[PDB]
């Protein structure tokens, strides 16, 4: 996973930084022009490696719940669906990891609204109850069915939480996760 | 805090090594003609830092992914007589540092 990306994209860059380096050395007196070229190559590869790092560190830190909310506001307004959120007391101390899980889920949910729902409006509820945080997303558009969905289910279930789908007044997704 | 530790270490050591590869590379370039033996020295320095980054990636990977302490002690006599993450990592470092040990 994280290991294959690290080892591969980053590994291959770093390996290459060494090889090109060593080549440019071999050419300092025989072909200084070609040493020079080789090293701009080195610097370009090193810069992009820094990008790779950025990305990896970003996945592993996890998206924050708050930031995911902000994001879904943006997304729905861009799809012209109306964003309703009656703000209430914030989740006590949810896991840093569980909070990512919720953010990822909420993401794919809201996405499915802008994609299939034909919805006018979309409600988002975040509430802390018992020793578990539950987020609800409903949308007033007809359900189109009966990847992403089974995905939420599983992420959330290895988590020890659950997912429900209700297609009576649209599609109301309910994710719950322990802390 | 474990994915948080890992993101942090990756960004730390690899952040720095890659900037250094940046700057040194750029220097050797500046020196190809005005000072080639120095350009060469600089570049050996770049290769070495690429090596050590490869090592660092290698090790972090190893943290996500006892016989070993025994033969590492051999190569200095040791005694032993018989959460997983924290305990194995911490004992590994413990004996790396001691390199008689039942704890030495
Ligand atoms: N809010 C919604 N309104 C209406 N239908 C929905 C819906 N959310 C999901 N669906 C239905 O579920 C189907 C598949 O959902 P899922 O998210 O698993 O796949 P998808 O079609 O979004 C592509 P991906 O697998 O890349 O997400 C859709 O084709 C659609 O019929
Ligand atoms: Mg989908
Ligand atoms: Mg030590």
Curated annotation (Swiss-Prot), chain A:
Residues 1-179 are cytoplasmic. The chain holds residues 182 to 367 of 370 of the full protein. It comes from Bacillus subtilis (strain 168). The modification Phosphohistidine is found at residue 7. Residues 5-179 form the Histidine kinase domain. It comes from the Bacteria. This is Sensor histidine kinase DesK. It is found in: Cell membrane. Member of the two-component regulatory system DesR/DesK, responsible for cold induction of the des gene coding for the Delta5 acyl-lipid desaturase. Acts as a sensor of the membrane fluidity. Probably activates DesR by phosphorylation.
